[PDB]
């Protein structure tokens, strides 16, 4: 489980975790509470998996977009700041940690990608994506290349995709229509197409990932890269003289980065909820705290109004905010992970040539708009079905297809719930399994239990719904 007394903190390996450990120590010098800071791999995946059972860190750091999922799963303890404190952080940033009218994490900083150029290799950076092929040609001559960024992650290639019309889920009347996915429209295609063409023409390489691009840029091998504030430190170390400017335009429109807001959320299974709140509110979210971290690795435009008033002077932050405004805040809904995985795949297959732009995006659209089982299960309230089945058993203890020689002398609300598993039978099964589990202990007899299994088994048919071929009800 989770030790009471200490604070364990998870944050991604590309963030200023050393800078955060310092705030960990200042907090310890004043508190005596041991603050541990870790940067595991795939922590945004691991957390859902571990916080579920009741383990993991007290605090979890990631971009706001994943927290909706965590919330829906009941993994995040709600956070509640006295009005005053809230007045210190930008409205904009508070919204990003708001799910179902609740605050589920603490905002830290606003992130957005910008175009980063080597002032040596390229005094004047291009205004347009279209300009780039010419450049690379020119640069290849001098033994260099025009541009290199991470292609393995959608986050990076999305600003171009989004430029001429691409979007994730439309925002219709105060909500996201997760059936209205715009990754397969003219714009998205145009964008991804241009991207692939760059590859087809030897201007960049489908296999290029983060570290490869970072190294290339930091060793002065390519004129341009695309990245976020976090990456500024390593360059500051690298002897390269760099500028940070607005991303190029495509078909005349600005690239539109998915703006994300670094957030800190408290494990809803942690004993140290108070300590956590005090840490984040009184130490991290302070001018010294943020600075300590921002020193290790730049946060972008911090959530706290006072320190940002300082940071704003930095031209790099200006360009960061410029790109951010051209962009859109990522949604934080549960379906976002689906969307991301979907697009990650499309981009890769298209980039690698396994598929065509039109095909890959078409698959992404289909898949990103498909509801996942785990989500549906969490949202399910299966009690009505439980109650129904129990009752039905009493009325069959003395009254077609009878169970025993003795049988041979709520339903709506339940079915309403099961309706949600009508398009995924494996899922329908899981829902039945969940029902079983939630009752096995309340089942006295055994005639009782198996006369429950069989009833449970043809429950979907009773609702006029589709049913699994097989379904183990251990």
Ligand X SMILES: OC[C@H]1O[C@H](O[C@H]2[C@H](O)[C@@H](O)[C@@H](O[C@H]3[C@H](O)[C@@H](O)[C@@H](O)O[C@@H]3CO)O[C@@H]2CO)[C@H](O)[C@@H](O)[C@@H]1O
Determine the size of the site formed for a copy of itself (CB under 8 A): 30
The binding site for Cl ion (CB under 5 A) comprises 40-41, 77-78, 82-83, 167-168, 185-186
Q: Which residues pair with residue 105 across a beta bridge?
A: none
User: Which partner from the list Cl ion, a copy of itself, ligand X, none does 344 bind, CB cut-off 5 to 8 Å by kind?
Assistant: ligand X
Asked whether the beta carbons of 270 and 2 are under 8 A apart, the reply is yes
Binding mask 362-381 for a copy of itself (x = CB under 8 A): xxxxxxx-x-----------
Tokens at 315, concatenated: 């031209």
Nearest to a copy of itself of 170, 426 (CB atom): 426
Q: What element of type H or E holds 224? A: strand 222-227
Asked whether the beta carbons of 222 and 216 are under 8 A apart, the reply is yes
Q: Is 388 annotated as a binding residue?
A: yes
CA gap 64, 177 in Å, rounded: 19
CA gap 270, 267 in Å, rounded: 5
Give the residue among 111, 108, 147, 141 at the shortest CA–CA distance from 126.
147
Among 215, 318, 359, 382, binds a copy of itself (CB under 8 A): 359
Binding mask 222-241 for ligand X (x = CB under 6 A): ------x-------------
Breaks (C-N over 2.5 A) in the chain follow: 399, 409
Binding mask 306-345 for a copy of itself (x = CB under 8 A): ------------------------------------x---
Binding mask 273-312 for a copy of itself (x = CB under 8 A): ----------------------------------------
CA 229-232-237 angle, 5° bins: 170
Determine the 3-state secondary structure of 256 from DSSP: coil
Among 131, 153, 322, 449, binds ligand X (CB under 6 A): 153
Nearest-approach distance from CB 136 to a copy of itself, in angstroms:
27
DSSP code for 304 = B
CA gap 459, 389 in Å, rounded: 9
Nearest to a copy of itself of 86, 381 (CB atom): 381
- Contact residues toward a copy of itself (CB under 8 A) are 342, 355-356, 358-359, 362-368, 370, 411-412, 415-416, 419, 422-426, 462-466, 469-470
């Amino acid at each position: 489980k989770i030790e009471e007394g200490k604070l364990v903190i998870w944050i991604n390996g590309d963030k200023g975790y050393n800078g955060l450990a310092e705030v960990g120590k200042k907090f310890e010098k004043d508190t005596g509470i041991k603050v541990t800071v870790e940067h595991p791999d795939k922590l945004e995946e691991k957390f859902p998996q571990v916080a579920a059972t009741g383990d993991g860190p007290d605090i979890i750091f990631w971009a706001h977009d994943r927290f909706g999922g965590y919330a829906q799963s009941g993994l995040l303890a709600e956070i509640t700041p006295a009005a005053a404190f809230q007045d210190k952080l930008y409205p904009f940033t508070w919204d990003a940690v708001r799910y179902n009218g609740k605050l589920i994490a603490y905002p830290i900083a606003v992130e957005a990608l910008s175009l980063i150029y080597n002032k040596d290799l390229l005094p004047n950076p291009p205004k347009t994506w279209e300009e780039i092929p010419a450049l690379d040609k020119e640069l290849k001559a001098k033994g260099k290349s025009a541009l290199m960024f991470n292609l393995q992650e959608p986050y990076f290639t999305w600003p171009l995709i989004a430029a001429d019309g691409g979007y994730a889920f439309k925002y219709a009347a105060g909500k996201y229509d997760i059936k209205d996915v715009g990754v397969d429209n003219a714009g998205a295609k145009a964008g991804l197409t241009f991207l692939v063409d760059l590859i087809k023409n030897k201007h960049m390489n489908a296999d290029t990932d983060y570290s490869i691009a970072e190294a290339a840029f930091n060793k002065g091998e390519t004129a341009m890269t695309i990245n976020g504030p976090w990456a500024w430190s390593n360059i500051d170390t690298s002897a390269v003289n760099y500028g940070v400017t607005v991303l190029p335009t495509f078909k005349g429109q600005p690239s539109k980065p998915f703006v994300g807001v670094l957030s800190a959320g408290i494990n809803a299974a942690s004993p140290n909820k108070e300590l956590a709140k005090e840490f984040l509110e009184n130490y991290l979210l302070t001018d010294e705290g943020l600075e300590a971290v921002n020193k290790d690795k730049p946060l972008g435009a911090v959530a706290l109004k006072s320190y940002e008033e300082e940071l704003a002077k930095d031209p790099r932050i200006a360009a960061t905010m410029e790109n951010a405004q051209k962009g859109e805040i990522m949604p934080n809904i549960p379906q976002m992970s689906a969307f991301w995985y979907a697009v990650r795949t499309a981009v890769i297959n298209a980039a690698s040539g396994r598929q065509t732009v039109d095909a890959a995006l078409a698959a992404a659209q289909t898949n990103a708009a498909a509801r996942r089982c785990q989500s549906q299960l969490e949202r399910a309230n299966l009690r009505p079905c439980e109650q129904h089945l129990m009752q039905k058993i009493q009325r069959d203890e003395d009254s077609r297809d009878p169970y025993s020689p003795s049988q041979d002398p709520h339903q709506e609300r339940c079915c309403n719930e099961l309706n949600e598993f009508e398009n995924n039978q494996r899922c329908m099964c899981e829902a039945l399994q969940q029902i079983m589990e939630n009752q096995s202990d309340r089942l006295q007899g055994r005639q009782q239990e198996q006369q429950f299994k069989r009833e449970l088994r043809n429950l979907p048919q009773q609702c006029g719904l589709r049913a699994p071929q097989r379904c183990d009800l251990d």
